[PDB]
């Protein structure tokens with residue numbers, strides 16, 4: 774993803790570690806991503822979070 778896309782995903786993750794289905798769809802539209810891309814990103818980000826804390 775672009776630098777900006779990643780930063781915006783990180784901004785949301787800091788606030789909410791899990792999103793609802795509707796929230797992922799809204800964020801996908803806002804960040805120019807597919808719903809599945811947002812879902813996968815957050816799964817992988819949670820794995821990083823678990824590893825690092």
Ligand code: NA
Nearest residue numbers: 791792812815
């Ligand atoms: Na999620």
